Amino acid sequence: DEQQSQAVAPVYVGGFLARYDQSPDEAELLLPRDVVEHWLHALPLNINHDDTAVVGHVAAMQSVRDGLFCLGCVTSPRFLEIVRRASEKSELVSRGPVSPLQPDKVVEFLSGSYAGLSLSSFKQVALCSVGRRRGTLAVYGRDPEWVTQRFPDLTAADRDGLRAQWQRSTAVDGDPFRSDSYGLLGNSVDALYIRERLPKLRYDKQLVGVTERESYVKA
Amino acid sequence: QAVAPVYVGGFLARYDQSPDEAELLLPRDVVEHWLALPLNINHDDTAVVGHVAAMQSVRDGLFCLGCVTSPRFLEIVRRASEKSELVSRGPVSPLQPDKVVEFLSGSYAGLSLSSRFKQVALCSVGRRRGTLAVYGRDPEWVTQRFPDLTAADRDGLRAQWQGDPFRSDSYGLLGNSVDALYIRERLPKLRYDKQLVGVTERESYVKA
């Protein structure tokens, strides 16, 4: 029960929502630095843009040298419990993370299922199987500092900005989740047919240098 | 009714296919020699969804036809299917929408025979090539999806296929879903299988 308790503790997620160095083929995905900074100077967090699947909120957004970076917090008790039960029936999760890391079923299931970040119009951030913008790898962890530290691009100045924010009671969060296991299950088949999902995910991890660090990323 | 029985058919093995590994070798003589089997999800004994009612060794391999009958499993699938964007898009032109059949076709596109033949598993993709799973509401229609089968092959199968054992849940199926996302070359394999058995998305519910 104590272990199950830790499992459903808050989960932080960080990663780039846009990479200023990546030029998308699709115009609708354009997101220039000047545009980001203009609107920049809490948004809800959901599953694949489904309004009935809100699992938490965004705690920080920082426009940095290489793109727009954000840090969210998965808090929904219902969502986390669903994820906990599913994680116990995953062969991938059973195999665990890279050596030094402590096994963390919930974090690992999230890292595998929703490895991408998606910003939509700012209005909301979605956790998805893989983002349409490149370099949008989602990094999960129990500590905000730890998550921010998985990204080699961020400097101490960058993290200070991010920290000031997440360290600074959201309108989005009782439990905002209005879906269920069946909903997540239905969405999982959609994720199985996204073309070049893994190649894109591997390209993303290498781009943001998470490969040079130890993390729960499964790609 | 979405929760009515769903039939599934396909080859459990293709005799002209030399498996990458050496433990997946299943020659014709061994098959015909040994030649109901429970049908489960990804070989999990707590996930029995029905049974295999027919098996026939044909020219190109071992073909089977099973039936998904578990009310619990079918209901779980029905609820998930209503929340799938892929399923909402429906099938190709002729075929009519069938959410449950489409979810199954998308999630468990492969067949897997495992022995110590003791059971057939519906899986995201089979380890043996050419094991594409074809789902439909009528077993005749299912077999007609495979060009390699002759009328004589069908006659033999027809005669064979012509309380809830599921002890799992949506959570278990969801856990299995994340594993499927990391099977390497999954879509290419399914496409290769589809090619090998002559089935097209244009005449079935296959999603790959």
Swiss-Prot record, chain A:
Q: Which reaction does it catalyse?
A: Cleaves -Ala-|-Ser- and -Ala-|-Ala- bonds in the scaffold protein
Result after altering residue 120 to A? Almost complete loss of protease catalytic activity
Q: Which residues form the active site?
A: 49 (charge relay system), 118 (charge relay system), 124 (charge relay system)
**Location within or outside the cell:** Host nucleus
Q: What is the effect of changing residue 192 to R?
A: 1800-fold reduced catalytic efficiency
Q: What does this protein do?
A: Protease that plays an essential role in virion assembly within the nucleus. Catalyzes the cleavage of the assembly protein after formation of the spherical procapsid. By that cleavage, the capsid matures and gains its icosahedral shape. The cleavage sites seem to include -Ala-Ser-, -Ala-Ala-, as well as Ala-Thr bonds. Assemblin and cleavages products are evicted from the capsid before or during DNA packaging.
Q: How does it assemble?
A: Exists in a monomer-dimer equilibrium with the dimer being the active species.
Name the UniProt record assigns to this protein? Assemblin
- The organism is Human cytomegalovirus (strain AD169) (HHV-5)
Describe which stretch of the whole protein the shown chain covers, with first residue, last residue and complete length. 4 to 256 of 708
UniProtKB/Swiss-Prot annotation, chain B:
Record: active site:
43 (charge relay system), 112 (charge relay system), 119 (charge relay system)
Source organism superkingdom: Viruses
**Catalytic activity reported:** Cleaves -Ala-|-Ser- and -Ala-|-Ala- bonds in the scaffold protein
Q: Where in the cell is it found?
A: Host nucleus
According to the record's subunit comment, the protein's assembly and interactions are: Exists in a monomer-dimer equilibrium with the dimer being the active species.
Q: What does this protein do?
A: Protease that plays an essential role in virion assembly within the nucleus. Catalyzes the cleavage of the assembly protein after formation of the spherical procapsid. By that cleavage, the capsid matures and gains its icosahedral shape. The cleavage sites seem to include -Ala-Ser-, -Ala-Ala-, as well as Ala-Thr bonds. Assemblin and cleavages products are evicted from the capsid before or during DNA packaging.
- Name used for this protein in its record: Assemblin
* Species whose genome carries this gene: Human cytomegalovirus (strain AD169) (HHV-5)
What gene name is given for the protein in this entry?
UL80
